[PDB]
Design an enzyme around this catalytic site. Structure first.
Site, PDB file in Angstrom:
ATOM      1  CB  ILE A 125      44.465  -6.528 -12.289  1.00 62.50           C
ATOM      2  CG1 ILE A 125      43.557  -5.325 -12.554  1.00 62.50           C
ATOM      3  CG2 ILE A 125      44.020  -7.282 -11.037  1.00 62.50           C
ATOM      4  CD1 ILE A 125      43.397  -4.390 -11.375  1.00 62.50           C
ATOM      5  CE1 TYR A 126      44.899 -12.147 -16.067  1.00 60.25           C
ATOM      6  CE2 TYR A 126      43.916 -11.069 -14.158  1.00 60.25           C
ATOM      7  CZ  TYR A 126      43.803 -11.910 -15.252  1.00 60.25           C
ATOM      8  OH  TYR A 126      42.598 -12.519 -15.539  1.00 60.25           O
TER       9      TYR A 126
END
Lengths: 218, 218
Positions: free
Chosen positions: A141-142
Site C-alpha cells: 500500500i505504502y
C-alpha cells in the site's frame, strides 16, 4: 547566517501530534519557526500544544480530518487568516484480515487527494510568500502511494517554480536510529540555503549491498 | 523454437478494441495465441471480432466495464470457463476545463483498483497455468498512475513468483513511430524465452541528452 535560518517562517504541518509529523513540528520549532498543525483528536492536540508552548515553541492548532474536503478548506482558511495570507512552508504529512482492492484503492486515493488538494489550497498562500516550500512526507500500500506521491511532487516542482514554489518528497528508511530523525532533512530542504533544491524524492534508507552490488528502495 | 512461441497460449487483454490494447491483441494473434478481450461498446467489439476472425485470429470477447467490480468478476468467470480454469497471460491495459483533485483521485484509484482486482481474480487461473504472466500496460494524472502501477507490478513479481507468476509493467514512449509498436515488447515478455524476466518497469521512450547528459522519463 540568514540562509540557514527558519526564524519566523510560517509552517503548516498536518498530523503534528504523532510520529514524524510531531518530530517535524519540534524540529522547525527549535529553529524559531511559527507553526500551525492539526489533528482529529482535539485532546491530544491540546496535549501537544501545551507541552510545546512551555518549551517556548510557537505552535497553534486546529481540529481537522484532512481526509475530508470541507475540513481541508477550513484548515487553510484558518491558516491564511493567522499568517496574513502568506505561507512559507507546507508539510503534507500523510496518514499512516488483509487489505482488499477497495481498501488498496481507498487508501491510495485518499492520500493522493488530500495531498494534492492541500497543495492547491495553499498555492496562492505559498505564492504570496515569494519563497514557498512544499514537502510530501510519506508495504505494498505504502509503496504504491509513495510511487504516486513522488510523481506529483516532481510535477508540482516544475509546474510551480515560476511562482517561486519548490516541492520535494521525503521518505523515512525501510531498513534503519529513530525514523523521526528525518525531520532535520525536512527542515534543511525548507531553508533559503536549499532554495535551488526542488523535485527531489529522497528516501534516507540504510541501503544494502549484495556481492558488492548495491540495492535501494524503488 | 518452443521458447519463442506463444502458440495456443491463453490471453486476456482488457480494452482490446482500440489503441495499444488492439495492437496487443493483433500481435499475440499473429503468434497463434488464443485471446479473450473486452470493451464497453458491444458493436465495436463485434466489429473487431469480425475483422479478426477473418484474418484467422482466434479471439473471443465479452462486454465489460472493467471499472466496475461485478463486471470484473463476471469477466474472469467467462475467461475461466472458456480456457478451462487456466490462463497463461493477463494484459492489464488501463483506460486512457481542467481536472480537479477529485478527478485526479478518482482516475488514479479507479485505474489502480481495476488492475489490482483483475490480477487477484486471475491469480488462481495464472497459478494453474504453471507459467503465468501479467503485464500492466499504462500528463500529471498518467505520471502518478504509472508511479503507483510500477510499484504494484514490482510487488506482485516478488509476491507471486513462487506460484510461477511473473509480472512486468510497460509504458509507451513520451517522446517518439506508432506507440502501438510496443506490442512486440509485450509479446516478448510473455514468451517462455523471457521466463526469467520479472519485476521490470520499461518505458520505451526516445530519450534525450543535454550537453551530453542523458534524461529519461521518471
Amino acid at each position: 547566517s540568514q540562509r540557514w535560518s527558519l526564524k519566523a517562517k510560517t509552517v503548516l504541518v498536518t498530523g503534528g501530534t504523532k510520529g514524524i509529523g510531531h518530530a517535524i513540528v519540534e524540529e522547525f520549532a527549535g529553529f524559531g519557526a511559527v507553526i500551525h498543525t492539526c489533528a482529529r483528536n482535539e485532546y491530544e492536540l491540546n496535549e501537544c500544544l501545551s507541552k510545546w508552548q512551555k518549551k517556548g515553541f510557537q505552535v497553534t492548532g486546529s481540529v481537522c480530518d484532512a481526509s475530508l474536503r470541507p475540513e481541508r478548506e477550513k484548515l487553510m482558511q484558518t491558516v491564511s487568516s493567522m499568517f496574513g495570507g502568506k505561507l512559507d512552508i507546507l508539510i503534507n504529512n500523510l496518514g499512516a484480515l488483509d487489505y482488499t482492492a477497495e481498501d488498496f484503492s481507498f487508501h491510495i486515493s485518499t492520500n493522493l487527494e488530500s495531498a494534492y488538494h492541500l497543495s492547491q489550497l495553499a498555492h496562492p498562500l505559498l505564492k504570496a510568500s515569494g519563497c514557498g516550500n512544499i514537502i510530501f512526507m510519506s508495504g505494498s500500500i505504502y509503496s504504491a502511494t509513495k510511487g504516486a506521491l513522488n510523481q506529483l511532487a516532481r510535477n508540482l516542482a516544475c509546474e510551480w517554480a515560476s511562482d517561486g514554489i519548490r516541492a520535494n518528497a521525503v521518505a523515512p528508511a525501510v531498513i534503519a536510529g529513530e525514523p523521526e530523525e528525518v525531520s532535520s532533512l525536512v527542515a534543511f530542504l525548507c531553508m533559503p540555503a536549499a532554495s535551488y533544491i526542488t523535485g527531489q524524492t529522497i528516501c534516507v534508507d540504510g541501503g544494502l549491498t549484495v556481492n558488492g552490488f548495491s540495492y535501494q528502495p524503488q
